[PDB]
């Protein structure tokens, strides 16, 4: 609402550059990683990468290089922004306090110029004589390192060659000499210039230019011996020193284009190479001393490499924009010792609230090609590991208090296989012990404290009752015929074990175990629970059971074992655990199957009647439950492959994910040294600890090995629709199996309508739980899935997946054909309901008020869904250049255009037509569009900018949209969607970006906006930004045609930074304002509640 | 196009490369937009057009009829087809209307609320767009061929006025001023242009067959004078340092400001280094220029390739600036094309001609 807050929910994960040197100390080996706005420093150690510092830059890092001028203790850092801020950074550490000083800084932007096609290039003379920059066609900027230039004052040199592919300073030259590949009509060539710092002009190169490969894209300068330059083309690799010409054309590299390289040896004997297909390569140079020959070997397969650097001893870092970045060890083959999560380009995403809880969860289409996946981003509660002790095998855990006087848990019992073990756990120290009266030689089904200062241990063999003042054993109950115990359930007084289908009810009395009720069950007992609700006794009137065979949860009258309620759960999957518990006031029955399905019921301590059935699936593995009391209230822990904590708030169940990997069993443990903590055990280890108050994002990956494009969620079908594209090459076939080919069932478009590597397009039906690919529909040859929608249309009750496409032929620049296709997925079958032919590409679609709204090329049109199951066109709006983006609120439509920016178009139900309401008369290239509310409109610029439009308030000129906001995001936004990752500010929008950063936008009242605005400004003065860049510059809306101060946007990243600043530095900022200290602390803290 | 999207989207290529790269694809697909009309007012042929620099919605025209028209080029409709209606006009009745042909009209840069006109009535008039009344008027001893202001900055208020006199005229919009004179041209100055790039550099072209670049801050002398032979030919004075073999009636700077384009009556177009004034020797072939007055032409901007659009006959010749290839000759007009201006926003083009009509040229596909 004209006042907007933007905060980063997830930093960018993509790596645009990596470099390796001695930055932090002359004797440290450093690895530096630039992730967009983010700079990560590391020290390479004996084992692993020690992280040291991470800093934000106000800008997108274009260039990162370390270099060492004569007279410096250690390497210096040179950075160039994409807004062209230049800086020279030093690493300065005083004690454990650690700062990055700006030694020199300036902005090298030219007022105007033609941005070069292959992009910004930073380079540095091997002698640190100058920094070269090729920013624009026609010029070469020189930043002299000769004198002491603290302002980084630079100057251009006219470059006659107007098309330059790549350039590098050459080693070993009496004056800085650049070598470069450039294109003119007659071809591509490699040329050289000396750079006169006195003449401020170029001089003739040391060696004359030579013709090079038509596709030669990449220049490597070779170190002092051999000298010269190596030039990587798509087909061949050539070497030029100026006296000698060496060229090789390996067949092995023809398949891909080589996009990056790293020198391994300092003498330049070995270079790493990498390509768009993921192949790592080794380039070798054989050897008064000169170069004999070149050789290429294929080292392996890593993430598609944006950039790569060798560290030491066979470990290589892989930066990847397109997918997970890697740390990989070399062998013939390559193994990834480490994997760094990157939500790759987030091409699309959607917010789903599964479990029908309060909270959102994000599912993204991420990466591309080999690296494509879905990522599931959700919030969750982490846990603290105080102790983790290796105990493979744990089949169960129980807390026990041994000393009846002590109110603290002193004993952890662990059941194993044919045995039970007992933990002494004195303080923070845990060691194996024995316990009298307890058998170690059987596996333990249940144990704990019980009535009259006694202990009980149930096993496969007997239920053994134990007096704990003397210890030893008082009573024991075995099955009459001495058969084995199937399942165990016991509360402080009562006990029920089941042997097969048979059931025994026991009570606990002084030095006695009293059997009362007995019965045999229709089918075999699966799980039981007797935990008493409402107490008033300590005796439970009811019994909780579930069975094999019929798969039923049943509640029985405990004394009699008569059946109160039997609910039929259905399906081949049998119940793993059943639990009775109370949240708030209300009584639930919880029963969790072996597939992760957890049903929860309304329970009556009287009827035993289960009412209002509900089910959520958390996890795919059998889920076992344990109750644990956390401070005020009782919570149920759920152990599974997606471990979850379940409780109540506002009298409606809440399921919090837990940021752990997998948990087989758990019990709460509070000891004198481990207070109110939890006992968790997985297949390998038994870990101890507590729940982390603060929620951090948890991320899961579903690798597709092909490219996700759109994704959307069909609730009734309990699955996601996803449009994917795999590449095949010339009939065609893939290089690798991907999600589209792994499908359990699959179909191919039969359409009759329309009649060296090609995209093949699939609609994937994907299960919302297993995330397996249920079905794959493959489109026509040369068909493209563009837009995808899940909705029901017209008076027709069926929910459909609707997909717009285009026919992509090589001969044509924009598609003159395409189609809309209605699919329905029900009863595990993908059905094609209908087709609609269209005169071109369907770039976007949105369900509009029970109608379908699609855009085709220049045309935005509305479809109605007939009683005949078809699409009848209602109205066209033809005034557009390219309509790429659609959003809707009510009868309002927001249309994102390629260049014409945005339009609020409306539907007059009366005339059955379209009327333009208002337009943005500022031309902008749109990435995304969102409607904030009936008035304000959010939009994303091609240039990494955000803006906001608003319906104005007299003449017929009310058709003019005012711009009430402008902000430079620094990220390219692919998708906007309403929703939040949680549960002062109205509204919440999330956005996915190319670098993987996830943002959130929300609205503020003017009173707030202004407060934060001042706070921003005072904060700015006090905070020392890295490159000495100006924050207000950083955020200033900027393009070719415009540069303006950000307005109507508060930078959350900047504001949330106020909590980390020095206590005094805080009081400095506060000062006068418009308010004191802890007041702002309070505010800024609340503002973090939003993500 | 689908590739443009999917690339930009997976961030394969830089979003503003694909953007430039598309933009050029469009210029290439340029054709006469028969779906867009411009409302006819001018009774005399259209001598000049200028599209508002920021956001480019409104455009100024001027006629041999001495009228100035102001159009809104935007479309409010449900439809793709529309006319560009004239918002305002300086007409036969307007007290301050020009008496003779209006040769140039230019938006005061950096302030939309004011535009400027020069005429053959020997005046330069400074207008005010809201009030549509005069603001400043300047008079000259001779007819005004070309005027211009610096697109680069607010560091100064100077206008450069080309007149029949051999002296180049610098009028200062701040106060009345204009005692500032550039000397050394021997004939009519038929064109004047400020560098897009440098604040104080101006380029002047004269019937004296010469082109000079000045730093106006200097009391005496120019910076360079364009010699078409790069001085490989030894001439007596009065001969040497000529741009063309005829009147030089056109001037344009390439978008970056690093080169100059001149059109002569010698039927040639030459591209020059804007710094040292060397001839780059780009071909272009024969380009017909017979005009006795000045010749307005323009350059593309914001695309991979830079194009120049120069009126050629009743057509508009499109060339590539650096390469020197003729792309196409845009044909809509039935009589001689006097000027054309480029719409930077959408890659469209607008042309004025002696048929008293303004044609719209938009890219197709």
From Swiss-Prot, chain A:
Residues 696-1004 are annotated as: WD repeat beta-propeller C. Residues 2-751 are annotated as: Interaction with CDT1. It is found in: Cytoplasm; Nucleus. Residues 754-1091 are annotated as: Interaction with CDT1 and CUL4A. Changing residue 548 to A: Strongly impairs interaction with CUL4A. Its main location: cytoplasm. The modification N-acetylserine is found at residue 2. Changing residue 925 to A: Impairs interaction with AMBRA1, ERCC8, DCAF5 and DCAF11. GO terms for cellular component: chromosome, telomeric region; Cul4-RING E3 ubiquitin ligase complex; Cul4A-RING E3 ubiquitin ligase complex; Cul4B-RING E3 ubiquitin ligase complex; cytoplasm; extracellular exosome; extracellular space; nucleolus. Residues 13-343 are annotated as: WD repeat beta-propeller A. One of its GO terms (biological process) is regulation of circadian rhythm. Residues 379-695 are annotated as: WD repeat beta-propeller B. Phosphorylated by ABL1. Ubiquitinated by CUL4A. Subsequently degraded by ubiquitin-dependent proteolysis. GO terms for molecular function: cullin family protein binding; damaged DNA binding; DNA binding; protein-containing complex binding; protein-macromolecule adaptor activity; ubiquitin ligase complex scaffold activity; WD40-repeat domain binding. Changing residue 524 to A: Slightly impairs interaction with CUL4A. It is linked to White-Kernohan syndrome: An autosomal dominant disorder characterized by global developmental delay, variably impaired intellectual development, hypotonia, and characteristic facial features. Some patients may have genitourinary and skeletal abnormalities. The core of the protein consists of three WD40 beta-propeller domains. Component of the UV-DDB complex which includes DDB1 and DDB2; the heterodimer dimerizes to give rise to a heterotetramer when bound to damaged DNA. The UV-DDB complex interacts with monoubiquitinated histone H2A and binds to XPC via the DDB2 subunit. Component of numerous DCX (DDB1-CUL4-X-box) E3 ubiquitin-protein ligase complexes which consist of a core of DDB1, CUL4A or CUL4B and RBX1. DDB1 may recruit specific substrate targeting subunits to the DCX complex. (Microbial infection) Interacts with Simian virus 5 protein V. This is DNA damage-binding protein 1. The lineage of its organism: Eukaryota, Metazoa, Chordata, Craniata, Vertebrata. The gene is DDB1.
Curated annotation (Swiss-Prot), chain B:
The keyword Protease does not apply. Changing residue 334 to A: Defects in transcription-coupled nucleotide excision repair (TC-NER). Its main location: nucleus. Pathway: Protein modification; protein ubiquitination. The keyword DNA repair applies. It is linked to Cockayne syndrome A: A rare disorder characterized by cutaneous sensitivity to sunlight, abnormal and slow growth, cachectic dwarfism, progeroid appearance, progressive pigmentary retinopathy and sensorineural deafness. There is delayed neural development and severe progressive neurologic degeneration resulting in intellectual disability. Substrate-recognition component of the CSA complex, a DCX (DDB1-CUL4-X-box) E3 ubiquitin-protein ligase complex, involved in transcription-coupled nucleotide excision repair (TC-NER), a process during which RNA polymerase II-blocking lesions are rapidly removed from the transcribed strand of active genes. Following recruitment to lesion-stalled RNA polymerase II (Pol II), the CSA complex mediates ubiquitination of Pol II subunit POLR2A/RPB1 at 'Lys-1268', a critical TC-NER checkpoint, governing RNA Pol II stability and initiating DNA damage excision by TFIIH recruitment. Part of the CSA complex (also named DCX(ERCC8) complex), a DCX E3 ubiquitin-protein ligase complex containing ERCC8, RBX1, DDB1 and CUL4A; the CSA complex interacts with RNA polymerase II; upon UV irradiation it interacts with the COP9 signalosome and preferentially with the hyperphosphorylated form of RNA polymerase II. Interacts with ERCC6/CSB (via CIM motif); promoting recruitment to lesion-stalled RNA polymerase II (Pol II). Interacts with KIAA1530/UVSSA. Interacts with a subunit of RNA polymerase II TFIIH. This is DNA excision repair protein ERCC-8. It comes from Homo sapiens (Human).
């Amino acid at each position: 609402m004209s006042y907007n807050y933007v905060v980063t929910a997830q930093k960018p994960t993509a790596v645009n550059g990596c470099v390796t040197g001695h930055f932090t100390s002359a004797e440290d080996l450093n690895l530096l990683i630039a992730k967009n706005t983010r700079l990560e420093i590391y020290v390479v150690t004996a084992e692993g990468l020690r992280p040291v510092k991470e800093v934000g830059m106000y800008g997108k890092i274009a260039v990162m290089e370390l270099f060492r001028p004569k007279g410096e203790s250690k390497d210096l850092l040179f950075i160039l922004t994409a807004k062209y801020n230049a800086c020279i950074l030093e690493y300065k550490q005083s004690g454990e306090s650690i700062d990055i000083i700006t030694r020199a800084h300036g902005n090298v932007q030219d007022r105007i110029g033609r941005p070069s096609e292959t992009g910004i290039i930073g380079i540095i003379d091997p002698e640190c004589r100058m920094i070269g920059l090729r920013l624009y066609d026609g010029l070469f900027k020189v930043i002299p390192l000769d004198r002491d230039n603290k302002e980084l004052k630079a100057f251009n040199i006219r470059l006659e060659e107007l098309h330059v592919i790549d350039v590098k300073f050459l080693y070993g030259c009496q004056a800085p000499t650049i070598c470069f590949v450039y294109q003119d009509p007659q071809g591509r060539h490699v040329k050289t210039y000396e750079v006169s710092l006195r003449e401020k002009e170029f001089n003739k190169g040391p060696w004359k230019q030579e013709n090079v490969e038509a596709e030669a894209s990449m220049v490597i300068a070779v170190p002092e011996p051999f000298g010269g330059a190596i030039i990587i083309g798509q087909e061949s690799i050539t070497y030029h020193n100026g006296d000698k010409y060496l060229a090789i054309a390996p067949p092995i590299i023809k398949q891909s284009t080589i996009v990056c390289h790293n020198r391994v040896d300092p003498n330049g004997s070995r270079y790493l190479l990498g390509d768009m297909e993921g192949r790592l390569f080794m380039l070798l140079l054989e050897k008064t001393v000169t170069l004999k020959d070149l050789r290429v070997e294929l080292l392996g397969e890593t993430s598609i490499a944006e950039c790569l650097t060798y560290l030491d001893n066979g470990v290589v870092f892989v930066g990847s924009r397109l997918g997970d970045s890697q740390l990989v060890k070399l062998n013939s083959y390559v193994v990834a010792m480490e994997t760094f999560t990157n939500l790759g380009p987030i091409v699309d995403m959607c917010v789903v609230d599964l479990e029908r809880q309060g909270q959102g969860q994000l599912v993204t289409c991420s990466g591309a090609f080999k690296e494509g996946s879905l990522r599931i981003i959700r919030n969750g509660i982490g846990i603290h590991e105080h102790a983790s002790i290796d105990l493979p095998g744990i089949k169960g855990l129980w807390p026990l208090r041994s000393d009846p006087n002590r109110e603290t848990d002193d004993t952890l019992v662990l059941s194993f296989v044919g045995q039970t073990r007992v933990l002494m756990l004195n303080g923070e120290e845990v060691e194996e012990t024995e316990l009298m009266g307890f058998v170690d030689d059987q596996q333990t089904f249940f144990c704990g404290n019980v009535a009259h200062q006694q202990l009980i241990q149930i096993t496969s063999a007997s239920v053994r009752l134990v007096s704990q003042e003397p210890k030893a054993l008082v009573s024991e109950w075995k099955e009459p015929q001495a058969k084995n115990i199937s399942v165990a359930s016991c509360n402080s007084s009562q006990v029920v074990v089941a042997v097969g289908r048979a059931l025994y009810y026991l009570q606990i009395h002084p030095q006695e175990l009293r059997q009362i009720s007995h019965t045999e069950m229709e089918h075999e007992v699966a799980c039981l629970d007797i935990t008493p609700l409402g107490d008033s006794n300590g005796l439970s009137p009811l019994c909780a059971i579930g069975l094999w065979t019929d798969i039923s949860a049943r509640i029985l009258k405990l004394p009699s074992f008569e059946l109160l309620h039997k609910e039929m759960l259905g399906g081949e999957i049998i119940p793993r655990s059943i639990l009775m518990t109370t949240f708030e006031s209300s009584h639930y029955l919880l029963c969790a199957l072996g597939d992760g399905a957890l049903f929860y019921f309304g329970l009556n301590i009287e009827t035993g009647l289960l009412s209002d059935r509900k089910k959520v699936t958390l996890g795919t593995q059998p889920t076992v439950l344990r109750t644990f009391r956390s401070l005020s209230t009782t919570n149920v822990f759920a152990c599974s492959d997606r471990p979850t904590v379940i409780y109540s708030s506002n009298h409606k169940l809440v399921f919090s994910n837990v940021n752990l990997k997998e948990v087989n069993y758990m019990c709460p443990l509070n000891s004198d040294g481990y207070p109110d903590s939890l006992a968790l055990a997985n297949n390998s280890t038994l870990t101890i600890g507590t729940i982390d108050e603060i929620q951090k994002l948890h991320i899961r990956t579903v690798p597709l090995y092909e490219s996700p494009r759109k994704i959307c969620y069909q609730e009734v079908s309990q699955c996601f629709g996803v449009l994917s594209s795999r590449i095949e090459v010339q009939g065609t076939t893939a290089l690798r199996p991907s999600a589209s080919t792994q499908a359990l069932s699959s179909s191919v478009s039969s359409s009759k309508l329309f009649s060296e590597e090609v995209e093949v397009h699939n609609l994937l039906i994907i299960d919302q739980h297993t995330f397996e690919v249920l079905h794959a529909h493959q489109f026509l040859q040369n068909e493209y899935a563009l837009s995808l929608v899940s909705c029901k249309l017209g008076k027709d009750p069926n929910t459909y997946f609707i997909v717009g496409t285009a026919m992509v032929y090589p001969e044509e620049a924009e598609p003159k054909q395409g189609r809309i296709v209605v699919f329905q997925y029900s009863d595990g079958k993908l059905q094609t309901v209908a087709e609609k032919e269209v005169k071109g590409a369907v770039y976007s679609m949105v369900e509009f008020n029970g109608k379908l709204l699609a855009s085709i090329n220049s045309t935005v049109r509305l479809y109605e869904w007939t009683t005949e199951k078809e699409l009848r066109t209602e109205c066209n709006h033809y005034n557009n250049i390219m309509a790429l983006y659609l959003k809707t609120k009510g009868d309002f439509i927001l249309v994102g255009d390629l260049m014409r920016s945005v339009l609020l178009l409306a539907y007059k139900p009366m005339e059955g037509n379209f009327e333009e309401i208002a337009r943005d008369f500022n031309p902008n290239w749109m990435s995304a569009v969102e409607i904030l509310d009936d008035d304000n409109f959010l939009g994303a610029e091609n240039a990494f900018n955000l803006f906001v439009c608003q319906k104005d308030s007299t003449d017929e000129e009310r058709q003019h949209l005012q711009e009430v906001g402008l902000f430079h995001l620094g990220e390219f936004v692919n998708v906007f969607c309403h929703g939040s990752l949680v549960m002062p500010t109205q509204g919440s929008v999330l956005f996915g970006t190319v670098n993987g950063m996830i943002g959130l936008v929300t609205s503020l009242s003017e009173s707030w906006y202004n407060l934060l605005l001042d706070m921003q400004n005072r904060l700015n003065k006090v905070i020392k930004s890295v490159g000495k860049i100006e924050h207000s510059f950083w955020r200033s809306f900027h393009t070719e045609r415009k540069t303006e101060p950000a307005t109507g946007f508060i930078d959350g990243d900047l504001i949330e930074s106020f909590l980390d600043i020095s206590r005094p530095k805080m009081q400095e900022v506060v000062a006068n304002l418009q308010a004191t200290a802890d007041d702002l602390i309070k505010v800024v803290e609340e503002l973090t509640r939003i993500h | 196009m689908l590739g443009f999207l999917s690339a930009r989207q997976t961030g394969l290529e830089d979003p503003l490369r694909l953007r430039r790269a598309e933009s050029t694809r469009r210029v290439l697909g340029l054709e006469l937009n028969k779906d867009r009309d411009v409302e006819r007012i001018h009774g005399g042929g259209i001598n000049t057009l200028d599209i508002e620099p920021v956001e480019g919605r409104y455009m100024l025209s001027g006629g041999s009829d001495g009228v100035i028209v102001l159009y809104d080029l935007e479309n409010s409709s449900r439809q793709s087809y529309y006319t560009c209606k004239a918002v305002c006009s300086i007409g036969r009745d307007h007290p301050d209307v020009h008496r003779y042909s209006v040769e140039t009209v230019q938006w005061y840069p950096h302030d939309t609320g004011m535009f400027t006109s020069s005429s053959f009535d020997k005046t330069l008039k400074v207008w005010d767009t809201n009030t549509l009344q005069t603001a400043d008027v300047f008079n000259f001893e001779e007819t005004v061929y070309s005027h211009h202001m610096s697109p680069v900055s607010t560091k100064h208020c100077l206008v450069a006025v080309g007149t029949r006199g051999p002296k180049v005229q610098l009028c200062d919009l701040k106060s009345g001023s204009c005692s500032h004179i550039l000397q050394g041209h021997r004939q009519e100055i038929l064109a004047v242009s400020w560098s897009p790039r440098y604040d104080y550099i101006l380029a002047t072209a004269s019937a004296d067959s010469r082109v000079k670049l000045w730093d106006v801050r200097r009391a005496s002398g120019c910076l360079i004078t364009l010699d078409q032979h790069n001085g490989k030919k030894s001439q007596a004075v009065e001969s040497a340092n000529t741009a063309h073999n005829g009147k030089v009636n056109g001037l344009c700077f390439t978008s970056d400001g690093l080169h100059l384009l001149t059109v002569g009556t010698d039927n040639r177009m030459r591209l020059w280094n804007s710094s040292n004034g060397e001839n780059t020797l780009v071909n272009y072939g024969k380009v017909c220029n017979n005009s006795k007055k000045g010749l307005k032409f323009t350059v593309s901007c914001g695309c991979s390739s830079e194009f120049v659009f120069v009126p050629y006959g009743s057509t508009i010749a499109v060339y590539t600036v650096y390469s020197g290839e003729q792309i196409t000759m845009l044909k809509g007009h039935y009589k001689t094309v006097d000027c054309c201006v480029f719409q930077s926003n959408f890659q469209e083009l607008y042309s004025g001609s002696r048929d008293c009509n303004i044609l719209a040229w938009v890219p197709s596909l």
